[PDB]
């Protein structure tokens, strides 16, 4: 919403400033985007009349003209532009003046012939970019009189957001309603006279959609003057609230929208076949637009037709053929309300945003059809002449909206507020803003006004008087409540405790966008379907991802394009793979996932530059989890991963429960997105190891511990983890430490096979051990190692 | 094309975690649930004056909890503190009500038995404004006992003396054993107190309470005798990893 | 809780935010599920206003919705987007930088 | 990250006052998201704020 | 519960906690230990010799007679304690007060918090990939400018 300031103080003039009013119109709930200037800035310039205009002697192009500017003498001006006659009333920049971009007029010769000044345009004064000739001013236009009085060009446009509610607020009237309450100063409106009939035709008008067009208002206008000229204070009142001049009916029509925030249209007569027809239309039913597209259209949608055809949809956009052209002469202004339930979203399912719809949808006010039609046409005989017919009123009293009868008590004011606000001063507000106020013991009970569609309960009241009052003026007061601690669970792992290891291992927390390219997410996940998004903000943002791994490797990818070949970084976030059985038919579950590449470390004197391995990331994940204390119960798996390179690859059992995997990036998926090397990559559930062991201290051994080692030979293929957790689990009464210390493969032990050198550490609370019963739990080991792997002692 | 293979299963390269002593993982369990409630915590120092661990809070130097204190001294005015209450008599100074601080720290006795040690660690909290009342000290201390041993146990309130409070206070748990168990002390703060800071008892009242974090630590880990704290067995610390 | 709890709870929470006593406007708006609704802004060094916060009384419709009587009970919420509250606090320029995940931009903030 | 940074901040200033934080899905219904918020399918928030739609 | 305002507290961002620096010496492999803060003089004398400390007229015991005046004294004791029982490599810290007679201080003491550790042994548990090496300066330094890495003003340190 856009509107000149001056026509805004033509019905309140405050006295305060420009931005004092803007500021005040901000505190009324009407954000205010931008305050600018009508036209650049200058001086100067004068309205003058060519009294005299001749051929240039010496340049086809250009005019040696004679203007008048009400001075001692005619001034010779030199203008190029192809609508400079001699009966015209120009706008001319005299001598001294200067103009936007320090464009001071100084005497000078044209092509040979002297000039003393320059004739404007409406881009030479930064008012528009019409550079199609000079300004035509009205043969009215005072000579001497500079153009900042004639045109009132010391004038601001104010754009303002208006919000789905205050539908009031879209016109002129509205803002100034609003504003005159804030100010306690009267609404001083023009006098809208009926114009009265003086000719006898009209046309049946009939709905058949009463619930949707409670009331549609008629009247024809007959032979009118189509091209004729827009006039300019219109011309700039328009152009002051961002609609630009096209046609002297469509000015009429969107001069009234802007003044009173009706909407209105004007169809041609003598192509309406039979009447009006306000119906639904038909499921199905085509209909061309004005822009020259097709709709069509839903047996939901309104429309305004004839006795065959559509024209238009109703309160939204106009058709092509039904509206004027530049032949017809008979009008027919339509001027209705519209149940906004009945135009809401019609618009959008086409694509379409108008003037109309956007004020239909949140409400115009249902006592303003008959003024807004009266001004119309009064408007449109004084721009294009003719005799109008009749008002035909077509009106449904039961399907209008009902003014809302609400009760605000004082009890939920104070309660809502918190601040005091006397009672005097509620009435008041109440009553400024059109509300029919009835006091009481406590309580009001007030009648919305019929232009108001947000006042419906009595909260709304609430924001009424609040507003008014100022939030600026209404006290802070800190929150009186209970001190109760809540539900703590020392066994819970908190998720920053997990990104604060990592931090403190080297790696950066990234976050990436939930959509990813499902063409990288199909080379990474082959054969699994994603989520997919219609209607995107891109094809490559267009795949809701199924692992973290998608986004993580395009940062490592976006990072090594920067020269920056060695990334760690990890991610937290919640993956959509698809399910049956999951709420929505997706499963979001929060993941952890990670990547690192490069050498291990950054250049060091004293470290040695080796690329990162398997090793360096199964590591890092074993410091995450032995938070969880549960680090006895994980084992790592050799399990296939098309990601993944299957030698290199690992999942991550918990007590059974896999959480996860860790491994190199496979060397194929490495060459495309032409990854720098080789990459380690993890991803976990964190639903699955959230919960960590609450401690519970035991007895510790006053006595010392013996150390024994063993040489276990296995094949290769035995994994080494599963004969460690073997040692520790036949040895519970006095094993309690279980380490491997050497793993050796060549030369002494056959191909395909290697030797574990492993260390027990035997320690009892109650007494210390000896000889004899070291090596028989020692030998209680070996055996087992060798009924589960067929392992030997070496 | 090669498979270079290897075995997943083999001890990731990393170096071990460590872990917090078990009194500090007490102290920052207590700070997190009063730190839900408003509580900032207030530091101060072990060495303190007879006046910010007596005079301030109604212990003249003719009481018997004084000398019959267990106290170390070091001239007849200095003294290694055997309360966190310091910290708390100069924040009242610095500032008025609303007051919801807990001071931990330090704080030095001269038994040394198995359920005594010569220093051990005391969280004390306080909270003064204006309508703070014997029911809010039972609620409040009710809901911290329930959610440090994550159970709803039996307690119990029961009179006793503390020269800086009246109403006084000590709360047990029905320990594991069938017979109850003193856990923290409290009260509502004395007049006498709330005076010589410049708070007055007609306008403002409040409560404060105390407690051991070698006893709670003993209870909620199950932790035999009191010098394994201090001994700092690596063996020992490392289960509160 | 009313209208005078909102307007303490966020001035307290701007202030210690930008760790400065910092001039708030409180000017009314719209949103679907509170009225009275509100928007606070605060002046950047730029001069102009800036916007960062949503909030109002929970509307009754809402609390009807899932078990709660508004003429038993009462509330306010708000609302905020990280990314605009980060870069007043930190000087970010442009905001598609956040999710680039250039290390060079995320070292700054160890 | 900078956000997180922030939110952990805003956490910690609402910690101290009794506020518990909560989680949830970023995939939800439209009785969620907009019906229980008094945002029913003919109102314009449903447009304005711009959803992405799966169905 | 408590009936009362729920007002927010001094917070400062440029505030570093005592726990993110514990915690990050937790990831680097080091243990907290709490120690007493009385010691033994006669193995303090010759970790600090000629500086006098406070001393208790009637402590305890004469090994718990002088008041610390750093934490190394206390540290390297635990670190014989694991020592005499079979654990040649500890890697622990702590932090607490140390009491230093000034003066100028308050009560003529100055009890400034102070943050002290000590490492020994191998750099590493015996590992199937990493060497026995025992550790040198340069590895307690790295893990001192990770804590100092944490203020922002590594920079605009020296040694
Ligand atoms: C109280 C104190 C000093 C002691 N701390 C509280 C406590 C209460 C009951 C048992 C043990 C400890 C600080 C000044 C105000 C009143
Ligand atoms: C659900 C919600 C969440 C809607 N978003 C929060 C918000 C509030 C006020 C201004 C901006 C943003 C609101 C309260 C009832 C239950």
């Known amino acids: 919403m856009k509107f000149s300031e001056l026509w805004l103080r033509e019905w309140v003039n405050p006295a305060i400033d420009s931005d004092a009013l803007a500021n005040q119109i901000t505190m009324a709930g009407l954000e205010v985007d931008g305050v600018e200037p009508v036209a650049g800035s200058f001086h100067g310039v004068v309205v003058g009349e060519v009294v005299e205009c001749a051929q240039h002697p010496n340049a086809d192009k250009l005019r040696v003209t004679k203007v008048n500017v009400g001075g001692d003498r005619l001034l010779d001006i030199v203008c190029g532009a192809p609508n400079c006659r001699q009966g015209l009333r120009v706008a001319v920049a005299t001598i001294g003046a200067v103009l936007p971009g320090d464009f001071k007029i100084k005497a000078a010769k044209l092509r040979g012939e002297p000039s003393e000044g320059m004739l404007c345009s409406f881009s030479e004064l930064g008012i528009s970019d019409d550079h199609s000739g000079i300004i035509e001013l009205p043969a009215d236009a005072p000579i001497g009189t500079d153009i900042r009085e004639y045109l009132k060009l010391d004038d601001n446009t104010i754009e303002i957001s208006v919000t789905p509610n205050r539908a009031d ?38 709905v058949e959609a009463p619930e949707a067009c409670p009331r549609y208002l008629g009247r024809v206008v007959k032979g009118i003057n189509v091209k004729a000229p827009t006039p300019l204070w219109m011309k700039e009142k328009l152009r002051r609230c961002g609609i630009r001049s096209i046609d002297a009916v469509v000015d009429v029509t969107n001069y009234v929208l802007l003044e009173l925030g009706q909407p209105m249209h004007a169809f041609d007569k003598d192509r309406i076949e039979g009447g009006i027809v306000v119906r639904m239309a038909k499921e199905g039913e085509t209909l061309v637009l004005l822009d020259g597209t097709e709709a069509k259209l839903n047996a939901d949608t309104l429309v305004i037709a004839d006795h065959n055809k559509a024209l238009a949809m109703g309160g939204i956009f106009g058709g092509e053929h039904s509206g004027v052209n530049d032949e017809t002469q008979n009008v027919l202004l339509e001027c209705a309300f519209f149940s906004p339930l009945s135009i809401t979203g019609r ?49 449904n009293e039961a399907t209008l909206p009902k003014r809302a009868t609400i009760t605000l008590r004082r009890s939920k004011l104070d309660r809502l507020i918190g601040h005091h606000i006397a009672d005097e001063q509620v009435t008041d507000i109440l009553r400024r803003l059109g509300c029919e106020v009835t006091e009481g013991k406590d309580e009001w009970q007030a009648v919305a006004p019929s232009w108001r569609f947000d006042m419906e309960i009595e909260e709304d009241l609430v924001e009424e008087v609040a507003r008014v009052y100022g939030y600026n003026n209404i006290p ?49 996940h082959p054969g699994v379907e994603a989520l997919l998004l219609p209607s995107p903000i891109s094809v490559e943002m267009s795949a809701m991802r199924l692992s973290l791994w998608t986004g993580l490797l395009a940062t490592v990818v976006y990072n090594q394009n920067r020269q920056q070949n060695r990334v760690r970084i990890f ?35 004293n470290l040695a ?42 999942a991550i059992y918990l007590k059974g429960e896999r959480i996860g995997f860790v491994g190199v990036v496979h060397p194929e998926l490495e060459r495309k997105l032409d990854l720098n090397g080789r990459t380690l990559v993890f991803e976990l559930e964190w639903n699955k190891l959230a919960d960590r062991v609450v401690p519970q201290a035991r007895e510790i051994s006053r006595f010392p511990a013996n150390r024994r080692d063993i040489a276990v030979v296995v094949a290769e293929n035995v994994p080494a983890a599963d004969i460690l957790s073997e040692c520790k689990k036949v040895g519970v009464n006095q094993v309690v430490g279980v380490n491997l210390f050497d793993v050796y493969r060549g030369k002494g032990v056959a191909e395909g096979y290697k030797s574990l050198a492993i260390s027990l550490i035997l320690q009892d609370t109650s007494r210390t051990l000896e000889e004899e019963e070291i090596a028989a739990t020692v030998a209680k080991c070996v055996e087992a190692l060798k009924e589960r792997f067929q392992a030997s002692l070496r | 094309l090669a498979a270079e293979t290897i075995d997943v299963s083999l001890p990731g390269r990393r170096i ?25 915590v207030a530091t101060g120092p072990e060495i303190e004056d007879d006046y910010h661990n007596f005079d301030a809070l109604n212990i ?36 008025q009500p609303p007051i919801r601080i807990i001071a931990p720290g ?93 708070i007055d008892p007609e306008v403002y009242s409040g409560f404060a309470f105390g407690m051991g974090m070698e006893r709670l630590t003993m209870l909620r880990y199950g932790v035999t005798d009191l010098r394994s704290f201090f001994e700092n067995d690596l063996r020992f610390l490392k289960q509160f990893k």
């Not at chain 1, 003037?355 to 119309?376: C, F, I, N, T, W």
């Not at chain 1, 802070?476 to 931090?503: C, F, W, Y």
């Not at chain 2, 003249?60 to 966190?84: E, V």
């Open chain 1, 169 to 206: 607020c879209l016109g002129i009237i509205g803002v100034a309603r609003d504003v005159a309450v804030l100010n306690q100063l009267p609404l001083v409106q023009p006098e809208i006279v009926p114009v009265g009939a003086t000719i006898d035709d009209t046309l049946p008008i009939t």
């Open chain 1, 347 to 395: 618009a959008r399912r086409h694509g379409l945003h108008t003037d109309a719809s956007h004020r239909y949808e949140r409400g115009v006010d249902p006592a303003l059809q008959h003024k807004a039609m009266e001004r119309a046409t009064r408007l449109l005989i004084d721009i294009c002449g003719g005799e109008a017919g009749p008002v035909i009123d077509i009106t």
């Open chain 1, 476 to 524: 802070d007061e800190p929150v009186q409540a209970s001190l109760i601690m809540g539900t703590h669970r020392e066994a819970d792992l908190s998720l920053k405790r997990v990104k604060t290891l990592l931090n403190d291992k080297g790696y950066q927390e990234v976050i990436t966008y939930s959509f990813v390219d499902p063409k990288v997410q199909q080379m990474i």
């Open chain 1, 571 to 605: 991610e937290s976030g919640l993956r959509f793979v698809p399910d049956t059985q999951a709420p929505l038919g997706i499963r979001q579950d929060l993941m952890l996932a990670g990547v690192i590449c490069g050498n291990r470390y950054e250049e060091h004197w």
């Open chain 1, 609 to 650: 530059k080796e690329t990162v391995d398997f090793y360096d990331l199964k590591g890092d994940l074993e410091s995450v989890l032995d938070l969880t204390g549960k680090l006895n119960e994980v084992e790592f798996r050799a399990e296939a991963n098309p990601a993944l390179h299957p030698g290199q690859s690992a």
């Open chain 2, 16 to 40: 071990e975690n460590g872990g917090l002593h078990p009194v500090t993982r007490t102290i920052d369990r207590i700070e997190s649930f009063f730190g839900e409630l408003g509580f900032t």
């Open chain 2, 60 to 95: 003249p130097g003719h009481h018997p909890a004084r000398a019959d204190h267990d106290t170390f001294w070091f001239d007849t005015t200095r003294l290694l503190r055997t309360q966190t209450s310091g910290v708390q008599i100069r924040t009242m100074k610095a500032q």
């Open chain 2, 106 to 198: 330090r704080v030095y006795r001269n038994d040394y038995d198995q359920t005594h040690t010569p220093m051990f660690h005391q969280m004390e909290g306080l909270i003064v404004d204006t309508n703070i009342s014997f029911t809010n000290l039972k609620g409040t201390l009710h809901d911290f006992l329930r959610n440090f041993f994550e159970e709803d146990l039996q307690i119990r309130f029961r009179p006793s003396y503390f020269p800086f409070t009246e109403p006084s206070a000590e709360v047990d748990v029905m320990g594991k054993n069938g017979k109850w168990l003193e856990v923290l002390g409290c009260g509502m703060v004395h007049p006498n107190v709330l005076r010589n800071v410049g």
